[PDB]
Structures are given as structure tokens and as C-alpha cells.
Design an enzyme around this catalytic site. Structure first.
Site, mmCIF file in Angstrom:
data_model
loop_
_atom_site.group_PDB
_atom_site.id
_atom_site.type_symbol
_atom_site.label_atom_id
_atom_site.label_comp_id
_atom_site.label_asym_id
_atom_site.label_seq_id
_atom_site.Cartn_x
_atom_site.Cartn_y
_atom_site.Cartn_z
ATOM 1 N N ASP B 53 0.837 -1.193 0.000
ATOM 2 C CA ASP B 53 0.000 0.000 0.000
ATOM 3 C C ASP B 53 0.876 1.247 0.000
ATOM 4 O O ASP B 53 1.743 1.403 0.866
ATOM 5 C CB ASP B 53 -0.927 -0.006 1.214
ATOM 6 C CG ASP B 53 -1.939 1.123 1.184
ATOM 7 O OD1 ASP B 53 -2.004 1.847 0.169
ATOM 8 O OD2 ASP B 53 -2.671 1.287 2.182
ATOM 9 N N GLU B 126 23.323 12.852 17.862
ATOM 10 C CA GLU B 126 23.274 12.977 19.310
ATOM 11 C C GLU B 126 21.915 12.514 19.810
ATOM 12 O O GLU B 126 20.888 12.785 19.181
ATOM 13 C CB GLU B 126 23.535 14.419 19.746
ATOM 14 C CG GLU B 126 24.815 15.005 19.174
ATOM 15 C CD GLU B 126 24.957 16.486 19.454
ATOM 16 O OE1 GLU B 126 23.952 17.119 19.839
ATOM 17 O OE2 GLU B 126 26.075 17.020 19.287
ATOM 18 N N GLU B 181 28.058 13.827 25.638
ATOM 19 C CA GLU B 181 27.783 15.174 25.167
ATOM 20 C C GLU B 181 27.611 16.116 26.360
ATOM 21 O O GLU B 181 27.712 15.712 27.521
ATOM 22 C CB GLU B 181 26.556 15.174 24.251
ATOM 23 C CG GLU B 181 26.474 16.354 23.287
ATOM 24 C CD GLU B 181 27.642 16.421 22.320
ATOM 25 O OE1 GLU B 181 28.279 15.377 22.075
ATOM 26 O OE2 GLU B 181 27.925 17.522 21.805
ATOM 27 N N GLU B 188 26.924 11.087 21.805
ATOM 28 C CA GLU B 188 27.132 11.422 20.405
ATOM 29 C C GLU B 188 27.886 10.292 19.722
ATOM 30 O O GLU B 188 28.752 9.661 20.330
ATOM 31 C CB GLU B 188 27.906 12.740 20.268
ATOM 32 C CG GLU B 188 28.381 13.067 18.865
ATOM 33 C CD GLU B 188 29.123 14.385 18.796
ATOM 34 O OE1 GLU B 188 28.521 15.429 19.129
ATOM 35 O OE2 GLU B 188 30.313 14.379 18.417
ATOM 36 N N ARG B 308 33.347 28.843 16.202
ATOM 37 C CA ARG B 308 32.626 27.583 16.109
ATOM 38 C C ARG B 308 31.152 27.718 16.464
ATOM 39 O O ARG B 308 30.458 26.704 16.583
ATOM 40 C CB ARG B 308 33.290 26.536 17.002
ATOM 41 C CG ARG B 308 33.214 26.841 18.485
ATOM 42 C CD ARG B 308 34.360 26.182 19.233
ATOM 43 N NE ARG B 308 34.234 24.730 19.264
ATOM 44 C CZ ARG B 308 33.348 24.066 19.993
ATOM 45 N NH1 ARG B 308 32.501 24.692 20.793
ATOM 46 N NH2 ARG B 308 33.314 22.739 19.920
ATOM 47 N N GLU B 325 30.707 21.872 7.422
ATOM 48 C CA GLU B 325 29.771 21.373 8.421
ATOM 49 C C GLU B 325 28.608 22.343 8.559
ATOM 50 O O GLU B 325 28.815 23.530 8.832
ATOM 51 C CB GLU B 325 30.465 21.176 9.768
ATOM 52 C CG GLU B 325 29.511 20.879 10.910
ATOM 53 C CD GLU B 325 30.229 20.605 12.215
ATOM 54 O OE1 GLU B 325 31.002 21.474 12.664
ATOM 55 O OE2 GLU B 325 30.020 19.520 12.795
#
Lengths: 436, 436, 233
Positions: B53, B126, B181, B188, B308, B325
């Protein structure tokens, strides 16, 4: 008797043995502020005024009592009687303080008087009646499952309601009618028309009088715009009318709708400017859980004569009783600011001859998005953040309320919304914990 | 061993005694869907496919199994081994189904191949680890109070974590590193680079493998973007790189920053178009509870090399390890749609030579609103409604995802938001019941 | 003194409790006892001076200077118990920096806008746990010494001291009140003026009692330490 001069107030205090006086005023956000004064200090207060801290409103200003606002609270402690009084706030240099909402309303009244108009407001106040826990803290337990206009409750809560009505009557409120509301344990009380200032003062007194009676009888009275999900909220509709030379401006026997052109301009101005002070009319986050489709609350900007679900409704009454009802506000709002903004917006609409457009008689909630776009039907702000964003860019609101009140109100609301937006509610845990 | 042909799969099933084969696919909203098939049916399924389906995704479809995706799940019931397999969805007329997210990712890969580029993605997932109640239902009690990179837990939860890692290694995931973490009970896991399709399939398998292990060891593993208030949320960062002729496109030894102009155009396109598919990268309401200032989650559109806290970060690694990233997505997102949109945005940026602007090397959160306005630092949607509104008017997203997926995703998210916006949360009662 | 126990007795007899702790709850404002004071000579207010721009006499300036000079020494008297210093922390209405102002509401010494016979000086350091007799006596003696010695109070601070930085405070020379009861006791011990004002007997007994109380307090292990360190270590 209507007290006029301070001598009358002193004579009444001596005759009825009043021991304490409660000065009354409200801050920018609508909270009721007060402090007590012994009876012997009353003569000195009348002669020179009372110094106090203005940080409660917004730092030292002087309060000048107004004898015409003297009244006695409707409870009798064993020690003696209790009375309240109002006044004006003045800076040490003698100039009036522009941050007082009462001063804002007075300025609005003066602006109206400049064109010879006077404004009468009769509001409809709605509230809940919940039970108290074993520790006396407020809860959300219902007291009855009645419906609209039902003859409920019939247990001791009936006696509580009757006591509330009698206490309000004993103060000279002159209530029109009181009845059950649609939601369970929801009640409504209507006020007689009067001058807007006295009406606002009466509403402010009424709130804490009802709360005190509810505590003393073992219950809780709540004014939250939406305390329960799935039931109707609590709103404060505002019937208003303009009077010139002792005659109703709105009424016009020569028109098919029995409404004057001035009423049309007033409605046009209100429709134009309602979005910019929706934040003032609905000041808390919970107010926008009530403004959702599917209930009596309006969420679309329109005016109608027969459709009673519109934002602005004209009752079928005509003649001296002609009035315009705005259905957006809720009891959590500050009556002074709301009434001042309503009057200023209506007057601005009258001055510029704003056309209110064609009335909407069909059910808006049953229409389509394309249909609403074609009709140009705007919507009220969805959340407090959107209302704040709309109000921030409005110069009309800024000039009506003054820079100080505008800035302080915006900062407080912004801080409250920022605090709210970062909370994780149990509904998210219920929906997402097992799914993810 | 790497299985290539269906004969290899059949031989492996016979050798290792696999009794059940489970299909694997995901719907538009990212939920994992599966159904069981007996081992004897496998040859017929390979020969002709399996009917099922299509309403589960979006109504009769045909699934053509892919032998190259055959894997054996990392638990051994006494009955026998269990295996999973993936495949492509075809309409009865034989045309491929355009509503499958895997098909969307395949189309994105083909579009990239049109210009000779291939992508490798290594994500960092995470998740939390909570305790189960007496009835085995998920709850939110912490298991340890460790911090960033802490050597915790040391009770049986340590054994549970080690078992999870061992199962992941046993399936052949080739994990790089796994660590605690910042938030308590948060962990993580990092993946190696590989083709984007295999990485997405591995992530989809990983989620339910970890959940099953957590149940069978007596705990609960949650992927909620923000299960607790006042602590860091869970995100899924995406490290990506483009390869041409077997060499890394991004790395340019001649440039002072050792980054090629193609990387600059890629970053520019991502910055330009991230606003329009932020809704896809953050699909649930709680994701925007995670996206608040004051944590590791980014809320401003910027790119940096040393800072960062930016939305896009360039790690110091160079050479073939050069990567970009993106830190907006969260584990609740659909990997296929997110990766496809990332690829499309990057390729569109490369085609048009979009300049990414000057990098932001300072702390954005410490700047004023006037400063960010002068710098032109734009912001991500504050709530799911704003993200939906932004995504609705995006021509690029619509043409990338196709009409069917676009419309269905918009309708589902709109319904979810409409359901959420009308709820009364206990925080409102706590703040407003007594005050009002 | 009468007020304290009258209120406590009424609170008991009505079923409640009235507390005078300087800081009973964490995260909320504490309880303080501000002291509005004025000096009257020849039946008229000394502080009021219609001819000055600030409507304050030079005697008031000297009084403020003396109070600012000597407040650090009898801070222990004005804040007698350990809990008093959980209230003297930045972030609330309690003042923690030594300054005087006319418009700033957070200064240690505040001058209300009232003038004439109502002219007054408000000191915002004391809390209800203090002994009124000793506190008032020390206030009067310090003010009188400041008046006698023509102590200049310096320039007022009309800005938010908390919003400033440590470098700015060092540049402006803004001292701070003692951080804990032990520091206040150490400051009081070397104060010749306090010993002269209070007399040897009261000085010695007060110091001994406060020293014993602090020594008893400093050796207790609080549940906060267990909640913070037991799992960590």
C-alpha cells in the site's frame, strides 16, 4: 449619597466609622496597586497629598486624592468599615505624570471634548468560578455543568453568586443583568452605561471585589481569557456611543439602517486601526488561545448588523440606545488604555471620513482562503509576538499613549514573550517522546 | 562480506539461517516503515517484487528489492537470524514513484552527476538515554550527571552504551568515535565518510537499532531535539564534501585559506537558500524550542573558520579531509530530503557563482540589533509556522522536491501546527491563574 | 522593639507566622530596615537650605561624608547575623557599593526629593535583625563626627554601579561593603571609633558572640555541597 467635597468625605468617615482608606490605581500592565492609610491621616492627605514610590507604576511622585471617587467596600470587618479612594499622580515639580494610564484616558477624553463629543461605555464582564484545594490555592475544578443562560448552580455556589450580585449592588454599581455563560461554571455581568472614566474605575474595583468575595466564601474567581481547552473563553465586550449636545450621534432616523454617517466613519477608523492595538486589547499570551476559529471569539476583521459572530456588531436597538459593540477585548486587558485607544481610533476615523466598507453578513469561518483574499478580509494577530511586531511600527499608538508608556509596555511584553517561547510543554513530550 | 547479486543474498540466507526478511523505507515525514517477509518468499520477491500500500508513504505500489542493501540485524533470537533489505518503489504502470524520498535523493545525485560531482557525508548524531518506568513506558529520568566528554556512565548504563557501540560495529558501520555530550545523559556518535545514499540508509537503520537495543536492555533512547529545558538539545551536524575525478573539489593549496572558489560558491548558495528549507531540516515543533539563543544551536546565518558558533563551520582539516559542516539539522529530520536539499542548494550556488560574503569571526550573540542590521545578519525562523510560511513561497524547494512531496509535507506540517497552536499549557496556568 | 513582638504574637494568634529574617528565600528580595534621619536645631531642620542648588546644607554634606567614611566599620552592627549577607548580593534592591545619590534609587545613601522640614537622609544598609539602639547610636555618632571634621562626601554617583566594570570602579574609587560576617568582624575589630562609641564592655561582648557564631557556622556541611559534589567527585 454622591460625595463631592472633602468635607462630605470626612463627615461620612466619621458617621460610618471608617478605619482604613485604600488608595487605588493601576500600573501600565493592568495590575491593581494599592496601599493603606489610617483614617486620621485623611485630612493631611487631602491637604497636601501622599508621597509614594512610582516604580510600582513604571521615582517619587505625589498622589492627590479625588473626593468624588470615594466609596465604601462591601464587607464589614469587626474592627470597622473599609473604604477606597482614587486620585491623580503628580511629579515633584508639580507637573502631572504622563505614565499613568488614568492620565492617558483623561487626555483621550479631552481630545474628544475638543470636538464636542462624550463617550459612554457599558462593558460585559465574564469570569469563571472554580474550587479551591485543601490548601486554599486556586484550582480549575468546575462547580457546575450548566449551559448558556442555564438556571445553575443550585448548590452553595448559588449562594456565592447571589452574594456577589448583592455586594456589587450595594456599592451602587447598577447592574443590568447577570446570567450563566456557555462554558461550564462561566458567568457574565453587564454594566449600565455611564461616563468612560467612572466605568473604568468601576471595572477595576469590580475585579478585586469579586475575587475577595470568592475567597471569603471558599471559591476562586478567575479572569483568564482561556483557562480550559475545548470550551469558550472569557471576553469583555465594549458597547460604546458618542453623545453631542446631550443627543446620540450614531442614531439617524433618516437612514435605512438608522445609523448616521459619523457611526460609519467611527467603524471605519476602528477597523483600520484595530490591528495596531490588538496587543493592548489582548495583553497576555493566554489571550491568543481564545482567538482561534470555532468559538464565539472573532478572528476576522469585519462589521455586521445581523451576523453576531463579526468583530464589530451593531445591536438592533436604536434611538438613544444606539451603540457599537467591539468583541475583541478580554478581562485581562487594562480598561484605561483599551478605552482610550478605542476612543482615539474612532475619533481619528471620524476626522478622516474613513469608509468602513460593505458589511459582511455571510459566515466568514465557512468561507475559503481565496474567497477571503478576494473580499480582502484581514485577520487578527495569531500570537503575542505578531501583535507586538504590529504595534511597534505604529506611530498612531505611540502618539496616543506617549513615549514612556509605549516603551515600557513594549519592553515588558517582549520580555514576557521571550520567557514564554523557550519553555518545553508537556504536550510536546506526550506527542514526540514515543514517536521519536 | 559485500553482497552484490541476489544469488549471493540467497546463499548468505541459507548459510546463516535467516528466517525473516524486513523491508525498510521511510514516509514523507521521516517515520520509518517496514513489514516482514518469510524467507521462502524471498526468491519470488526478487523475481517479481512485492505489492503493498502506497498510502503508508503518501494506492497500490510495487517494491523492487535491491540485493546490495542486504544486512543482518545485530541480535540473535533463538528462532533464527533476522535481516533487512531496501528497494525502489514503482507504480503499477512501471514508472518510478516520484513521492519516495529515496527517489528524491537519487534525482539529486543524478543532477550532481550531470556536472561530474559526487558527495560524501559523515553525520554526528546525538541522542539521550532515559530510564523506563515500572510499566516500560518512555520517561525522562537522567542516568548520569556527566558533562562534555566525561567518562560516564559507570553503572549498567555503561554496559548498555558499550553494547550499542558493539552492535553498531558488528553491523559494519565503521564508527569513528563515540563520546558523552554536554547535557546530562546525552551521547554522540560519529560516522565515516561514504556515499550519501549509504549514509542516509545507515542513519535510518541506526535509529531503530539503537531504540531496540535500549528497550531490550531496559532503558530508552530518545531523539527528541529538546527533551529537557535548560540543557543543550540534540542535533545532527552534516559534514559534506564534493569530489571530482577522485579528488576533493574544496581543497585548493594555492589559496591563503586553502579553500577553492567552488567551496565559496557552495557556501554562498547554502547561505542564500537555507531559510527556505529550514522547515525540512527542522520538521517538528520542538526543534524550534531547541533553536534559541544561548546554547550551541545556531540561530544566525553566517559562516566562519575559527569561530565555532556559526551556522556553517569550516574545520581546520585540509587535503582530502576538507569538509563543510552545517549545524542546523536535528535527528528528527528526514535524512533523504535534508541531504537532497543540501546538494541542490550547493549546486545552485556553484552554478550562479554566488558570493558567500565576508566571514563572521566575532560572537554574533554579543552584538546589538543595530550592529547585526548593519552587518546584514539575517535569522532563521523563530517557530514552525514561520518556517512553513517561508517554505511555501519557495520555487526552488518546490522544483527540487516535486509537487507531490511538497504539497503533502506542507499539508501535514500545517495540520500539526494548527493542532498545536490551540493547546493550553500548564505554564500558562502557573503564570496567569493567580495573577489574573 | 515593641512592634516586633506585637506582630509576632498577632501572627501566632491568627494562625500564621511573621518572620524578620533578612533573607528567608533564595531568588527573591530580602527584608531591610531603611532609616530616614534628620537633624533638628533650634526647632528647625538643619539639612534644608533654600539657597543651595540641591536645597541641601553643608552640614548635610558633612554628615553624608562621615557616614560614608565610617559605614564599613559598623556594617557588622547594621547586619548582625550570617543570613544578612545573603541579602547583600548584587542583583536586587539591597546596596553593595558605598555611594550617595539624589536621583539614583540603588545607592547606599539616598536623598528623597522632599524638602523643607521633611528633608531627610535614607540609609539602606540595615535589616530588621539589627539592634535599633546600637545602629541608631552609631549612625548619630558617625554623622556628628563627620560634621565636626568637615568630611567632604565627594561627588555623587548618578549612574548604575552594577552595570559598570571593576576597572571603572577602581578608577572611581568605589568601595564595597564586607562580603561576609567574618570580614565585617575583622573590619570592626580594628575600628577605634566603634570601640570608643560603644564602650569596651559592649564592644568585647559583641565581638566574642559574633566570633563564636561565625566559628560555629563555618564548619557545617550544607546540602548544596552534597548535591553539587557527591556525584561529581
Amino acid at each position: 449619597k454622591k460625595c463631592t467635597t472633602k468635607e462630605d468625605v470626612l463627615e461620612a468617615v466619621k458617621e460610618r466609622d471608617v478605619k482604613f482608606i485604600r488608595t487605588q490605581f493601576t500600573d501600565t500592565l493592568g495590575i491593581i496597586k494599592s496601599w493603606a492609610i489610617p483614617a486620621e491621616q485623611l485630612e493631611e492627605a487631602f491637604e497636601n497629598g501622599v508621597m509614594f514610590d512610582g516604580s510600582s507604576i513604571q521615582s517619587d511622585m505625589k498622589l492627590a486624592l479625588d473626593p468624588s471617587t470615594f466609596r465604601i467596600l462591601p464587607w464589614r470587618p469587626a474592627t470597622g468599615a473599609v473604604a477606597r479612594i482614587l486620585g491623580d499622580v503628580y511629579l515633584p515639580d508639580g507637573n502631572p505624570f504622563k505614565g499613568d494610564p488614568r492620565y492617558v484616558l483623561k487626555t483621550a477624553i479631552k481630545e474628544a471634548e475638543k470636538m464636542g463629543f462624550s463617550m459612554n461605555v457599558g462593558p460585559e464582564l465574564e469570569f469563571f468560578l472554580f474550587k479551591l484545594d485543601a490548601n486554599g490555592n486556586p484550582t480549575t475544578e468546575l462547580t457546575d455543568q450548566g449551559g448558556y443562560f442555564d438556571f445553575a448552580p443550585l448548590d452553595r455556589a448559588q449562594d456565592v453568586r447571589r452574594d456577589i450580585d448583592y455586594a456589587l449592588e450595594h456599592m451602587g454599581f447598577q447592574i443590568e443583568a447577570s446570567h450563566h455563560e456557555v462554558a461550564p461554571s462561566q458567568h457574565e455581568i453587564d454594566f449600565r452605561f455611564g461616563d468612560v472614566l467612572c466605568t473604568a474605575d468601576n471595572v477595576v474595583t469590580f475585579k478585586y471585589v469579586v475575587k475577595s468575595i470568592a475567597y471569603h466564601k471558599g471559591y476562586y474567581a478567575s479572569f483568564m481569557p482561556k483557562p480550559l481547552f475545548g470550551v469558550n473563553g472569557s471576553g469583555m465586550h465594549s458597547n460604546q456611543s458618542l453623545f453631542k449636545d446631550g443627543k446620540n450621534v450614531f442614531y439617524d432616523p433618516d437612514t435605512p439602517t438608522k445609523l448616521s454617517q459619523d457611526a460609519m466613519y467611527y467603524i471605519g477608523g476602528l477597523l483600520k486601526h484595530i490591528r495596531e492595538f490588538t496587543a493592548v486589547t489582548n495583553p497576555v499570551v493566554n489571550s491568543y488561545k481564545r482567538l482561534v476559529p470555532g468559538y464565539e471569539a472573532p478572528v476576522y476583521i469585519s462589521w455586521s448588523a445581523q451576523n453576531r459572530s463579526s468583530l464589530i456588531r451593531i445591536p438592533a436597538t436604536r434611538g438613544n440606545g444606539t451603540r457599537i459593540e467591539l468583541r475583541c477585548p478580554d478581562p485581562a486587558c487594562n480598561p484605561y488604555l483599551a478605552f482610550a485607544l478605542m476612543l482615539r481610533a474612532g475619533l481619528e476615523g471620524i476626522k478622516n471620513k474613513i469608509d468602513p466598507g460593505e458589511p459582511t453578513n455571510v459566515n466568514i469561518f465557512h468561507l475559503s482562503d481565496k474567497e477571503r483574499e478576494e473580499r480582502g478580509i484581514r485577520s487578527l494577530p495569531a500570537d503575542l509576538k505578531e501583535a507586538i511586531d504590529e504595534m511597534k511600527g505604529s506611530k498612531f499608538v505611540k502618539e496616543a499613549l506617549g513615549e514612556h508608556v509605549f516603551s515600557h509596555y513594549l519592553c515588558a511584553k517582549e520580555m514576557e514573550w521571550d520567557e514564554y517561547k523557550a519553555v518545553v510543554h508537556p504536550w510536546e513530550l506526550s506527542r514526540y517522546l514515543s514517536m521519536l
